[PDB]
């Protein structure tokens, strides 16, 4: 969730 292309959440 650090990368611009991310799509998988986090927290």
């Amino acid at each position, epitope marked *: *969730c*650090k990368e611009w*292309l*991310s799509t998988a*959440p*986090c*927290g």
Partner: antibody
Amino acid sequence: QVQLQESGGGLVQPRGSLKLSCAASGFTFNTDAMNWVRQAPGKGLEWVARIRSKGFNFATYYADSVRDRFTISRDDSQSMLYLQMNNLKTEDTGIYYCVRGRDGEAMDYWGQGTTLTVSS
Amino acid sequence: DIQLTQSPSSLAVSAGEKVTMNCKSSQNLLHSITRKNYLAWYRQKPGQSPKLLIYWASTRGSGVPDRFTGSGSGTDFTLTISSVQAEDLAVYYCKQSYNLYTFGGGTKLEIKR
């Protein structure tokens, strides 16, 4: 229906500051990433800022030309998107669009825009 | 910064005809893993906000009619409009999402009457 209404544009003097606002409606604001795109007088579009959802710890991205000057933020509980602009320059003159942009897909809905003129 | 270049800068076709415009990326937009091309197409009608027409280079957006066909891969993409009608005059921009965002100069469509 999805409704993005921006307000707050106007005449501001160089090196001044202005804060835009966007009221979102018709969709779960808490889940989508929001963007600000602008269009200079008689020119093409230029993406300005982006703020991902809480599930992505509110990650913010800024175009090179707007970095360290503008500040995108949001209020999930009020469904408001903000763009605090500082050290304004003439280059920042144009219409500012409020865009709902799902991370992974594309820029879904755009607002009607709000004009901003930077001049003395 | 990825630079997208579009051509022609303007086009003029008659109603009922089909038109094809191009967009070329300075960097390759094809993602190795998903095999998806991060390129979208938008259009802006006179005095209106931009509207999404296509994303991932070929998937039409919701509600967008089948007249709009997006194609290409890598660094070269195309938007094809069939049955070009009066209501289609606008400026068409291709945008990239591979890294940050970047739109192209746009291509203007005019109706030959």
